[PDB]
Amino acid sequence: SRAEYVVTKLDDLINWARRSSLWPMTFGLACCAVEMMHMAAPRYDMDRFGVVFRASPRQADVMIVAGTLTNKMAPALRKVYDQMPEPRYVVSMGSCANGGGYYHYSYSVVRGCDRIVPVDIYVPGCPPTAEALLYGILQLQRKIKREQKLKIWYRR
Amino acid sequence: ILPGAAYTEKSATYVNTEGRAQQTKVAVTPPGLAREDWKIIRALSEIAGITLPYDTLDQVRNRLEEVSPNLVRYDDIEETNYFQQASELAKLVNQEVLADPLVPPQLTIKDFYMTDSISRASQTMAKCVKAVTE
Amino acid sequence: LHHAVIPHGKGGRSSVSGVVATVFGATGFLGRYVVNHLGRMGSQVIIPYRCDVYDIMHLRLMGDLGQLTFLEWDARDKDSIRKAVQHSNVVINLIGREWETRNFDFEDVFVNIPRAIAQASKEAGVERFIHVSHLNASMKSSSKSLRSKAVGEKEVRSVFPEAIIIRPSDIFGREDRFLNHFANYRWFLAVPLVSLGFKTVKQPVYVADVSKGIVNATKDPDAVGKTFAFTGPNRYLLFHLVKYIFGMTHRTFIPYPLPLFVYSWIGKLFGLSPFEPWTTKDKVERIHISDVMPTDLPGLEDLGVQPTPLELKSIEVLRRHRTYRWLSSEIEETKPAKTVNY
Amino acid sequence: KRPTVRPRSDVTHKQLSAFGEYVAEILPKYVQQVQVSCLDELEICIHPDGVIPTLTFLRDHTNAQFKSLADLTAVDVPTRQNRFEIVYNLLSLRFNSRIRVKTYADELTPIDSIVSVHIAANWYEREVWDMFGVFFFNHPDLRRILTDYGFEGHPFRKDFPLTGYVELRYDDEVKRVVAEPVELAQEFRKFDLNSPWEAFPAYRQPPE
Amino acid sequence: GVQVSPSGEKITHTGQVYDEKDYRRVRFVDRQKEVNENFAIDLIAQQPVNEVEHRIIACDGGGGALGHPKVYINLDKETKTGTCGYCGLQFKQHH
Amino acid sequence: PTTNPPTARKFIWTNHKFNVSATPEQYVPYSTTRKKIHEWVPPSTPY
Amino acid sequence: FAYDGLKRQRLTEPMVRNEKGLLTYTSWEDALSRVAGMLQNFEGNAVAAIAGGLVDAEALVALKDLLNKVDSDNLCTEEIFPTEGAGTDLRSNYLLNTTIAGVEEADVVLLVGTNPRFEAPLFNARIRKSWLHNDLKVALIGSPVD
Amino acid sequence: TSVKPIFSRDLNEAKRRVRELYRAWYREVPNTVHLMQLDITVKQGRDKVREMFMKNAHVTDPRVVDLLVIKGKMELQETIKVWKQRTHVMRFFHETETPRPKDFLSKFYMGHDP
Numbered sequence A: 001s002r003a004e005y006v007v008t009k010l011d012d013l014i015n016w017a018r019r020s021s022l023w024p025m026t027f028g029l030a031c032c033a034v035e036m037m038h039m040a041a042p043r044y045d046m047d048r049f050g051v052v053f054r055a056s057p058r059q060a061d062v063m064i065v066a067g068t069l070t071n072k073m074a075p076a077l078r079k080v081y082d083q084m085p086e087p088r089y090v091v092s093m094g095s096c097a098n099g100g101g102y103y104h105y106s107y108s109v110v111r112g113c114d115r116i117v118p119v120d121i122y123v124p125g126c127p128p129t130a131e132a133l134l135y136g137i138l139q140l141q142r143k144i145k146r147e148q149k150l151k152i153w154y155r156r
Numbered sequence B: 001i002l003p004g005a006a007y008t009e010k011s012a013t014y015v016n017t018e019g020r021a022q023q024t025k026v027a028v029t030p031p032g033l034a035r036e037d038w039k040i041i042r043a044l045s046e047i048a049g050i051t052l053p054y055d056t057l058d059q060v061r062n063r064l065e066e067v068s069p070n071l072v073r074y075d076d077i078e079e080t081n082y083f084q085q086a087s088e089l090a091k092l093v094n095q096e097v098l099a100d101p102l103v104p105p106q107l108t109i110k111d112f113y114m115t116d117s118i119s120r121a122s123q124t125m126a127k128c129v130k131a132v133t134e
Numbered sequence C: 001l002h003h004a005v006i007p008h009g010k011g012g013r014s015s016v017s018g019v020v021a022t023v024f025g026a027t028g029f030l031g032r033y034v035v036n037h038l039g040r041m042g043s044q045v046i047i048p049y050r051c052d053v054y055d056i057m058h059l060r061l062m063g064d065l066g067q068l069t070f071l072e073w074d075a076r077d078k079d080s081i082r083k084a085v086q087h088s089n090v091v092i093n094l095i096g097r098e099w100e101t102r103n104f105d106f107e108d109v110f111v112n113i114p115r116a117i118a119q120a121s122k123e124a125g126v127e128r129f130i131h132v133s134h135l136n137a138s139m140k141s142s143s144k145s146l147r148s149k150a151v152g153e154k155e156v157r158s159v160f161p162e163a164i165i166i167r168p169s170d171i172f173g174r175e176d177r178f179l180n181h182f183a184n185y186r187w188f189l190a191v192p193l194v195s196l197g198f199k200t201v202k203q204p205v206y207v208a209d210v211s212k213g214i215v216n217a218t219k220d221p222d223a224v225g226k227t228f229a230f231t232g233p234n235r236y237l238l239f240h241l242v243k244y245i246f247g248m249t250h251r252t253f254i255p256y257p258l259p260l261f262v263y264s265w266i267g268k269l270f271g272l273s274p275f276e277p278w279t280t281k282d283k284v285e286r287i288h289i290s291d292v293m294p295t296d297l298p299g300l301e302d303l304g305v306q307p308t309p310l311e312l313k314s315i316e317v318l319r320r321h322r323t324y325r326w327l328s329s330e331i332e333e334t335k336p337a338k339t340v341n342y
Numbered sequence D: 001k002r003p004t005v006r007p008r009s010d011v012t013h014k015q016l017s018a019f020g021e022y023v024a025e026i027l028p029k030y031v032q033q034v035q036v037s038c039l040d041e042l043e044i045c046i047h048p049d050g051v052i053p054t055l056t057f058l059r060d061h062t063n064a065q066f067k068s069l070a071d072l073t074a075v076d077v078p079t080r081q082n083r084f085e086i087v088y089n090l091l092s093l094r095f096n097s098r099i100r101v102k103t104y105a106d107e108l109t110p111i112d113s114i115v116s117v118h119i120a121a122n123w124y125e126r127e128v129w130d131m132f133g134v135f136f137f138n139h140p141d142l143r144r145i146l147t148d149y150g151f152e153g154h155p156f157r158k159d160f161p162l163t164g165y166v167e168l169r170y171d172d173e174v175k176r177v178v179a180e181p182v183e184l185a186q187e188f189r190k191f192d193l194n195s196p197w198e199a200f201p202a203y204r205q206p207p208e
Numbered sequence E: 001g002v003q004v005s006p007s008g009e010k011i012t013h014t015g016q017v018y019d020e021k022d023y024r025r026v027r028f029v030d031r032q033k034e035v036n037e038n039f040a041i042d043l044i045a046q047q048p049v050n051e052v053e054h055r056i057i058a059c060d061g062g063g064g065a066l067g068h069p070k071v072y073i074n075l076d077k078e079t080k081t082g083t084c085g086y087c088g089l090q091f092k093q094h095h
Numbered sequence F: 001p002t003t004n005p006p007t008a009r010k011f012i013w014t015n016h017k018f019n020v021s022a023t024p025e026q027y028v029p030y031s032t033t034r035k036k037i038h039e040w041v042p043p044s045t046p047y
Numbered sequence G: 001f002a003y004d005g006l007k008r009q010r011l012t013e014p015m016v017r018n019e020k021g022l023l024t025y026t027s028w029e030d031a032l033s034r035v036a037g038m039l040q041n042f043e044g045n046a047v048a049a050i051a052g053g054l055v056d057a058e059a060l061v062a063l064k065d066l067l068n069k070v071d072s073d074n075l076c077t078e079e080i081f082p083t084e085g086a087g088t089d090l091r092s093n094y095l096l097n098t099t100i101a102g103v104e105e106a107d108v109v110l111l112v113g114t115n116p117r118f119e120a121p122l123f124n125a126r127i128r129k130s131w132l133h134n135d136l137k138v139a140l141i142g143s144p145v146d
Numbered sequence H: 001t002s003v004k005p006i007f008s009r010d011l012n013e014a015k016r017r018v019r020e021l022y023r024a025w026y027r028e029v030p031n032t033v034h035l036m037q038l039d040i041t042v043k044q045g046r047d048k049v050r051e052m053f054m055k056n057a058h059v060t061d062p063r064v065v066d067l068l069v070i071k072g073k074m075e076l077q078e079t080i081k082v083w084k085q086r087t088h089v090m091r092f093f094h095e096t097e098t099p100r101p102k103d104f105l106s107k108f109y110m111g112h113d114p
């Protein structure tokens, strides 16, 4: 119907604004965070996609888990994630974050950040190259593009 | 039917032809819902109201001790005497020997491969039987 | 048992529990507790969802790798219901609304959809069917939602004769619409209570117990075909409950009476909301329909769950309704409510 | 001249033997053994009572001046009664040399703390206590340093399992990170790698 | 080849396939079973037998250092071919 | 490749396939081995 | 090589007879509940047990204690051993008293009704070893097996 | 059987340090509960303190009681300074862990473990 069509284009409108402004939380754990700094470096310039690092979880949209999550740091990662306003997305980057990686069998490591927070995109690698992370970030925008919140509200 | 463990799947005591006591060890655990064989009878005993006085492998072997104490002397040959007594009780048996030739159940390697349940469930032993036969 | 469902492990996440449950309604308040209990013991859980994927994210971390299977379904399409209940040995129905929408009324949600699920579960060859209803479900009930629940119970048992029916009282928890509903009356200065809340009795139950007994019914041999009453261990007059809640939030309690017809008319205004109504006529009715006395029905304790008092767990629900001056006030600073044996 | 085998030197091994005798003559109350490896590294093995005096002399003596504590660590050898070997690696900038001082400990026999000698040791002794459970007397601030708060056990002890006993996950029912017994989807596979043939005749032990 | 089971699931080249009543089939609902369709067993059987004169022949798989370790096969048993234990190529003696 | 084409092989994919994640073509892991322990099948007749 | 029989024909689930007389999978609590129910009736001669060729001593003693607790003494084994004379009173009657390593010291072996090659393959190995090195004389009362 | 003491010369001189640690832990529950905004009562917290002290009721070697007291002071300090979090304090209460039955039959139904 006309209203169902209008709701669709309003859905694209709000998605587009969230796709075009992803503000990751300044937050990296280990060597994977070095490649996340390279994605911010001139060659890739994530800023040109509208991606701006913000220190405060209140001002951040995306949490990129870029390094190993140990048991000591697990509660703190969850707390800054809880304090992220919604909508909010997690990119798990690297083997350590993806599933433990080189430390999977360590007594002190969380075997994957997805035991602690819900993860949207998994980026393989140890570390993923800055392009691999960039591909993952741009794969998160397409996930948002497929969001259908307003349309589903209409059919409730 | 009560699914029990196999010898690879439990720590069990066996006594060989010399009388030497020796024990297996768990390699894998029993499949499916199978359970260790002495704990089924212990589980059974409690349901039926006549609970048996042992709840762990340690206590069951202590009970084996109370019966025949050489079943916990692992890897040990316990010398036995008193054969003269057994003979003196054997001279009184009035039963007499038949004339049947003494023919063992296994004459040839054909009958060797499949004797017990595990031998009979083996596809390798079936090949060996089929191999010597044909 | 098929060899892939025999339970192994020690009931941790990486264990196998032998339960393969399709939970219909896992995306709601009680759903996240049912999936978590199923998921933590190592159960395969199929989760049919109609909402946006964003709204099922909090469930993703409730099972080990592979133990959660999300499926898109439309309650109008039968073929999608079969698609989900096809591989289960138990199906749990938690579908429900506290209000009516354009596309689904109380009959749809509480009768047709449960019957559609039960009808497909019987054809698919599912051993257990757990259906949640209500304690005050009855055909002689004032509440329009509570009559449909009574019908739905019977439809479910016509097409799945051995269905297990769970009847919880009011469920209270972090995301409930029970203690957070009264704690939110503070925004309107005063607390309108029909008859001042002294005629209504309530025996609320903690959500984790409801969910822990629902999961215990997925494996209890002595549950097929029974109806259960899940209720708290304490009955309170609505007044004392609402007074206690404001004691737990340390807000100012100013109760005044309001005749049911004036209260029922207000609920109609809030029900015009195009979004999720703050209240409705049916929600106002249900708040004042008094809990039935428990007479001859197995309860929580028959499924191995000990009811949790409303006193142990209120502060985890109500601390966020406090101001800074009272955030740190401990459970003991609040006087407990007064119970009634009728 | 062999282009594959490490050059051997000569003078350094002779020098470190002379200083090893030097140290043993001066501290005969504490020194139990002195050796120099084929890598040319001097080791002093002392009675644990001698730790503070031994590192004090080696730090302040004029013909030593081992003023830097390169590091401090323990090795767990369960077959020994005193299963913890405490190792101090010291550096002399004056003489451009290095020296290893070793003592031992058990579970219930704490060592003295050298924080009065080398402030560098403060955190190193926290790490030994945390990872091996070796208590140090007179430590200004002895508390865990590397393990999670309220972590039970000493994970660098040889008998502590590699994956530990507990693991963490987020539990949405209670809304926090919880600890639970460890279960692994895939168990760590232990490989038996030792060859049954002897590789070094020079280290063969008598079969007595 | 890619046989299909009575349940309709494709059978992998290793012969695996979930039973009818195996619940683990639910992972493929609204998705697919990754199957590789070029069965190496079927492809290797298509190669012709190379004929050689000598009784002992070396196979390295081709490409020299890009193949497998070089081995030799006896060709005396003139009733079956000689098969490479690495690449599966077959050899037979000319006379 | 317009001047140095790759070597042709009969098993090389003719049709490329991009990242199929999130779609109905997505890979789903599973065990590629067959059952190991075979269970006893009871007789289908009375005794 | 017979261990591969441990992977076929395995009992993995308790089973009982349903109303058509067929074995059906059930639960441990269910299945034990049937056997206890029957065990509480019968006592004495009415309950008997047979032990097979692959039973552990921890299960023979367990099954012995259970049946002795309902008065029964019919604990039997498929193997036969003459119970006349001493019977199993004296261990020396039913054991290999010279041991397996004692074959290496004898100088005559008399075999009575047995094919050791197949009944005890490693005991026939120890005989031939003494036959080879110690020059053991060996005689066989029985069939002319190889 | 002669050994260097850590601090105490025998069990009685060590129990003095135990009761002094139990006092400190007892005084701190009402603060931990108040500052960490735990969802328990003081009585329930203090009972848990007592439960942990009785977990080691069989120890008799004086050196061992010295190292339990040493550890308990470290645990007390981690709590007073709020180095621990709700999650850490609440781990003592094992609230998410179903407890394994201690009877033979229940173990027998549940798996192979003793």
Ligand SMILES: NC(=O)C1=CN([C@@H]2O[C@H](COP(=O)(O)OP(=O)(O)OC[C@H]3O[C@@H](n4cnc5c(N)ncnc54)[C@H](OP(=O)(O)O)[C@@H]3O)[C@@H](O)[C@H]2O)C=CC1
Pocket: C024, C025, C026, C027, C028, C029, C030, C031, C049, C050, C051, C075, C093, C094, C095, C096, C097, C098, C104, C109, C132, C133, C134, C135, C168, C169, C170, C171, C172, C176, C177, C178
């Ligand atoms: N106080 C309580 O919570 C009590 C609850 N109950 C019963 O427990 C069950 C769940 O309670 P609660 O969890 O509070 O209910 P919720 O309000 O949490 O909604 C439950 C689920 O119903 C689903 N649902 C509702 N309508 C539809 C529909 N038309 N098609 C598909 N899915 C639908 C929702 O999915 P979506 O979110 O995508 O719509 C949601 O996941 C209900 O039967 C309720 O009546 C009984 C007694 C008390």
Ligand SMILES: CCCCCCCCCCCCO[C@@H]1O[C@H](CO)[C@@H](O[C@H]2O[C@H](CO)[C@@H](O)[C@H](O)[C@H]2O)[C@H](O)[C@H]1O
Pocket: C175, C176, C177, C178, C180, C181, C184, C185, C188, C192, C266, C270, C276, C278, C279
């Ligand atoms: C004459 C005036 C009389 C006073 C008015 C009568 C009282 C009617 C209003 C009662 C309170 C309304 O307060 C409303 O409570 C409902 C019930 O949970 C909450 O409802 C919603 O809250 C959040 C929002 O995401 C959800 O998580 C929740 O599940 C949903 O129910 C609203 O967030 C709150 O705003």
Ligand SMILES: C/C=C(/C)[C@H](O)[C@H](C)/C=C(C)/C=C/C/C(C)=C/Cc1[nH]c(OC)c(OC)c(=O)c1C
Pocket: A026, A027, A028, A029, A030, A031, A033, A034, A036, A037, A040, A052, A053
């Ligand atoms: C200011 C805004 C920006 C856009 C900047 O350009 C970039 C992108 C942000 C930076 C520099 C850091 C982003 C996240 C973060 C906190 C990383 C951890 C980190 N940071 C380090 O140094 C800074 C290290 O140094 C050795 C590390 O090891 C580690 C592990």
Ligand code: SF4
Pocket: A030, A031, A032, A033, A066, A067, A068, A093, A094, A095, A096, A097, A101, A102, A125, A126, A127, A128
């Ligand atoms: S995955 Fe590799 S690069 Fe990334 S944090 Fe772990 S070890 Fe470092």
Ligand SMILES: [Zn+2]
Pocket: E059, E060, E061, E068, E084, E085, E086, E087, E088, E089
């Ligand atoms: Zn080859």
